[PDB]
Structure formats: C-alpha cells, structure tokens
Amino acid sequence: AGNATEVPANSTVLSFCAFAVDAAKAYKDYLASGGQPITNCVKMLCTHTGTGQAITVTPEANMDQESFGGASCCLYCRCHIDHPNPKGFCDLKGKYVQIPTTCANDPVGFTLKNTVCTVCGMWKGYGCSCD
Amino acid sequence: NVTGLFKDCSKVITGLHPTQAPTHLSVDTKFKTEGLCVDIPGIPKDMTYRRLISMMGFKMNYQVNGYPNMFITREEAIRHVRAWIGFDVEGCHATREAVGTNLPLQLGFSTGVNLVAVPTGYVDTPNNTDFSRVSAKPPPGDQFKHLIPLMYKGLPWNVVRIKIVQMLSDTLKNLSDRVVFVLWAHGFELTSMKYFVKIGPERTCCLCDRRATCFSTASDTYACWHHSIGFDYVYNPFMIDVQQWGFTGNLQSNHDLYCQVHGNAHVASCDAIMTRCLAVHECFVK
Ligand SMILES: O=C1C[C@@H](c2ccncc2)CN1
Ligand SMILES: O=C1C[C@H](c2ccncc2)CN1
Ligand SMILES: [Zn+2]
Ligand SMILES: [Zn+2]
Ligand SMILES: [Zn+2]
Ligand SMILES: [Zn+2]
Structure with a gap:
C-alpha cells in the first residue's frame, strides 16, 4: 500500500540528515566526506527565456539557469523535517526555483548555501543587480 | 528502483503539482x-492536502568525518556492556486517511519501563511537514489484543521523549558515558528513534568535560547523563542488532536456550528485557 517517493541512491543521505540536530551542516559534511548530492529533484523543461529571478510562480530560467520544483530543492522538504523559519513554513515549496546551470548538479546544496536579494529578486553572486 | 523510505501513504490517487512534490517520482503523471x-x-497547486509520509526504511550506513557510527560491532558492544539498554517497540497501523505504515505505540525498555505514545506521524502539507496525531488502529489478531486499551492512554511525543531521556539518565549516569540500545530486528526500533534521537559530531556537556548524551531543543545545548534534567532528545546513542549474530528463530526461542527466569508476558518491556538478557548470556556466560 502507498506510493514511493524516493530512490535508493538517496536513502543514506536523507537518513543522516533526517536525524541530525543541524541538517544543513550534516548535508554539507556528507558532501565533504565524498557523498553524492541528493538526486530525484523535480527538474523542469522550459524555454530558457525567463526573467532569471530566483523564486517564481512559473518556471523563469534564463539561458544561464535551470528551473526546478521548489519543494524538491529544499533539504527540509526532502527530509520531512522542521524548517528553520520562525513559523516553520517553507519559502520554496509551491514555487519554482531557478538554479545556475553550473550548480544544477546539486540544487539542494545550492539553496542551502545561497541567499535571494530582496530588492531585485535574483540570487546574490548569481545575478543580483544591486552590488 | 525505489525505496519504501518516505513512501506516501495517503489514499489520494494522483501525484503532486511540480512545485509541491518533494521528488520527481512524486509528481503526478500528467506533468x-x-x-x-x-x-x-x-x-x-493543491492547497489543502495532508499526506502521511512513512518513516520506515532508514539506512544509517553513512561514513562522515567526525560523526560516530550509530551501529557498533559485537566487540565494541561487549566493552560497553554497562551501557546496554534493551529496547523494543510495539506499533499501531495507519488507518482511514492513510494506509501503509507503522506508528510507535508502546516503547519498552530493559529497565521494565513501558511508555505509551499518542499515534503520531509525519504529514506533508502545502507549507511544511506537520508532526501530528494520525488515525491508527492496533494490528488485528489475538496476539495484539493487549494494545487495544493503549490507543487511548498515550502521551504526546513532547512528553514521551522527555521521559525517555530522564529514564536513561537515571539508569546510566553512574554506569556509562553512553547508551547502547540492544535490539532484535532493528527496523521499527530505528524508525521509532526518529521520534526521540538526534545525531551530530561528538560534543561535550554544557557543565562538564563528559561527552554529551542528550540534546535540548529549548536552548540548543548538550548535556551528559548527570546534567540532562529537562532535556528532550537522546544525542548520539549507539546500538546493536542481536538478531544479526547468527540466531535462526524468533527472540523468545533463542532467549529461552540460556534463560528461564524471564517468562514471556507479551509486552514491549518484556521483549526488551529478553533481548538484553539473551545478549548478556551470549557474550558473558561460560
Ligand atoms: O502519478 C502519480 C505519482 C504517484 C505518487 C508517488 C509518490 N508520492 C505521491 C504520489 C501517484 N500518482
Ligand atoms: O548495573 C546495572 C544493570 C541494570 C540494568 C538492567 C536492565 N537494563 C538496564 C540496566 C541496572 N544496573
Ligand atoms: Zn521546504
Ligand atoms: Zn539585488
Ligand atoms: Zn555534564
Ligand atoms: Zn532472561
């Protein structure tokens, strides 16, 4: 009974992060010890003529990015654990997230390490027009 | 190739919207x-769903620098026999809004303690994962009849985990710097540990040089067994599955080969007492 959501290549990393006091640190450490990044994300097919904004209602990848389903790029959603937000809600679930193509092999790791500019809506260091 | 870990146990026929699905497998076929x-x-997008996610199938076989192994060898377990706590969990089944997973109901320990939890699961919603009470029933059969009254005598998990930390601390503070859970067929015991165990690098207590055995979500601090009053999580426990030592039949038949003072009273604490007792006879007698 039920429907599988996961593949065996992700069992170890998701188990490790599901039990960690600090899941983001555990994921970073798992990668540094040679582990594979989380796979089975929701990658979208799009026209690559989007705005390039980081978090959007529909896919908005420009030619330097890929678009993903937002929950699938969130470590807390993938491990079914608490979000470190004040009210415990997610800012990626229910949106699409644009990830630089050079980082698209590890979308979960990308969202953990990076920040969206509140002024221009683009990732800091990967599109932000403010600095 | 798929795993049962994080299986969606809802009865919704369709999959999720691409922005809400945790994984490509979970997206509905239409997309x-x-x-x-x-x-x-x-x-x-679907803005009102509640999808129970199964916690059966954890795999603790990572090798990450600075994080200790949870499962230990027979040789390491023997050196830490004073840390041994037998542990067994009897579960209840998801029902009604979900089907296909086991929830912890009676948590038993070799100290003779049984703790009863409200049937609680991890329910994905449009905004987060809601750790909440879920519909459940004991498994059918005369061997599981004793679980029927327990369905309405459970305590919330925030209370149960404090009681587990207090019991372990009182039992072990003068015996060991750690705990070794002694298990028989560990899968469901490891799923139950998700509800009261946290892991990370080896740490020291917030009041001494002893290694940390407990963690508090109230202050994000670490404590040994002596300084853990009010702490809610067991931190970096160790464990061993005795069934993997070459036994063939059930727990009771192997336990009874060495011991006769522990009669089977069919309860989680009894199974936990038998598992520790069997391990003690196998490693230390004759
Ligand atoms: O097309 C589909 C996807 C499938 C599902 C898998 C995992 N979690 C939820 C739903 C059910 N229908
Ligand atoms: O020296 C001991 C062993 C005893 C014990 C019995 C069962 N489970 C755990 C511990 C308590 N004191
Ligand atoms: Zn999330
Ligand atoms: Zn900016
Ligand atoms: Zn201490
Ligand atoms: Zn015995």
Whole structure:
C-alpha cells in the first residue's frame, strides 16, 4: 500500500540528515566526506527565456539557469523535517526555483548555501543587480 | 528502483503539482514528458492536502568525518556492556486517511519501563511537514489484543521523549558515558528513534568535560547523563542488532536456550528485557 517517493541512491543521505540536530551542516559534511548530492529533484523543461529571478510562480530560467520544483530543492522538504523559519513554513515549496546551470548538479546544496536579494529578486553572486 | 523510505501513504490517487512534490517520482503523471516535468498553465497547486509520509526504511550506513557510527560491532558492544539498554517497540497501523505504515505505540525498555505514545506521524502539507496525531488502529489478531486499551492512554511525543531521556539518565549516569540500545530486528526500533534521537559530531556537556548524551531543543545545548534534567532528545546513542549474530528463530526461542527466569508476558518491556538478557548470556556466560 502507498506510493514511493524516493530512490535508493538517496536513502543514506536523507537518513543522516533526517536525524541530525543541524541538517544543513550534516548535508554539507556528507558532501565533504565524498557523498553524492541528493538526486530525484523535480527538474523542469522550459524555454530558457525567463526573467532569471530566483523564486517564481512559473518556471523563469534564463539561458544561464535551470528551473526546478521548489519543494524538491529544499533539504527540509526532502527530509520531512522542521524548517528553520520562525513559523516553520517553507519559502520554496509551491514555487519554482531557478538554479545556475553550473550548480544544477546539486540544487539542494545550492539553496542551502545561497541567499535571494530582496530588492531585485535574483540570487546574490548569481545575478543580483544591486552590488 | 525505489525505496519504501518516505513512501506516501495517503489514499489520494494522483501525484503532486511540480512545485509541491518533494521528488520527481512524486509528481503526478500528467506533468511528465520528455524525461522531465512541465508546468501546465491552468493546472493549479493543491492547497489543502495532508499526506502521511512513512518513516520506515532508514539506512544509517553513512561514513562522515567526525560523526560516530550509530551501529557498533559485537566487540565494541561487549566493552560497553554497562551501557546496554534493551529496547523494543510495539506499533499501531495507519488507518482511514492513510494506509501503509507503522506508528510507535508502546516503547519498552530493559529497565521494565513501558511508555505509551499518542499515534503520531509525519504529514506533508502545502507549507511544511506537520508532526501530528494520525488515525491508527492496533494490528488485528489475538496476539495484539493487549494494545487495544493503549490507543487511548498515550502521551504526546513532547512528553514521551522527555521521559525517555530522564529514564536513561537515571539508569546510566553512574554506569556509562553512553547508551547502547540492544535490539532484535532493528527496523521499527530505528524508525521509532526518529521520534526521540538526534545525531551530530561528538560534543561535550554544557557543565562538564563528559561527552554529551542528550540534546535540548529549548536552548540548543548538550548535556551528559548527570546534567540532562529537562532535556528532550537522546544525542548520539549507539546500538546493536542481536538478531544479526547468527540466531535462526524468533527472540523468545533463542532467549529461552540460556534463560528461564524471564517468562514471556507479551509486552514491549518484556521483549526488551529478553533481548538484553539473551545478549548478556551470549557474550558473558561460560
Ligand atoms: O502519478 C502519480 C505519482 C504517484 C505518487 C508517488 C509518490 N508520492 C505521491 C504520489 C501517484 N500518482
Ligand atoms: O548495573 C546495572 C544493570 C541494570 C540494568 C538492567 C536492565 N537494563 C538496564 C540496566 C541496572 N544496573
Ligand atoms: Zn521546504
Ligand atoms: Zn539585488
Ligand atoms: Zn555534564
Ligand atoms: Zn532472561
């Protein structure tokens, strides 16, 4: 009974992060010890003529990015654990997230390490027009 | 190739919208094309779902620098026999809004303690994962009849985990710097540990040089067994599955080969007492 959501290549990393006091640190450490990044994300097919904004209602990848389903790029959603937000809600679930193509092999790791500019809506260091 | 870890146990026939699905497998078939997913204009997100996610199938076989192994060898377990706590969990089944997973109901320990939890699961919603009470029933059969009254005598998990930390601390503070849970067929015991165990690098207590055995979500601090009053999580426990030592039949038959003072009273604490007792006779007698 039920429907599988996961593949065996992700069992170890998701188990490790599901039990960690600090899941983001555990994921970073798992990668540094040679582990594979989380796979089975929701990658979208799009026209690559989007705005390039980081978090959007529909896919908005420009030619330097890929678009993903937002929950699938969130470590807390993938491990079914608490979000470190004040009210415990997610800012990626229910949106699409644009990830630089050079980082698209590890979308979960990308969202953990990076920040969206509140002024221009683009990732800091990967599109932000403010600095 | 799929795993049962994080299986969706809801009875909803369809999958999720691409923005809400945790994984490509979980996206509804309608969005899948050309090896990936597409957004379909006019097909909205679902804003009211509650999908129970199974915690059966954890695999603690990582090797990460600075994080200790949870499962230990027979040789390491023998050196830490004073840390041994037998542990067994009897579960109840998800029902009604979900089917296909086991929830912890009676948590038993070799100290003779049984703790009863409210049937609680991890329910994915449009905004987060809601750790909440779920519909459940004991498994059918005369061997599981004793679990029927326990369905309405459970305590909330925030209370149960404090009681587990207090019991372990009182039992072990003068015996060991750690705990070794002694298990028989560990899968469901490891799923139950998700509800009261946290892991990370080896740490020291917030009041001494002893290694940390407990963690508090109230202050994000660490404590040994002597300084853990009010702490809610067991931190970096160790464990061993005795069934993997070459036994063939059930727990009771192997336990009874060495011991006769522990009669089977069919309860989690009894199974936990038998598992520790069997391990003690196997490693230390004759
Ligand atoms: O097309 C589909 C996807 C499938 C599902 C898998 C995992 N979690 C939820 C749903 C059910 N229908
Ligand atoms: O020296 C001991 C062993 C004893 C014990 C019995 C069962 N489970 C755990 C511990 C308590 N004191
Ligand atoms: Zn999330
Ligand atoms: Zn900016
Ligand atoms: Zn201490
Ligand atoms: Zn015995």
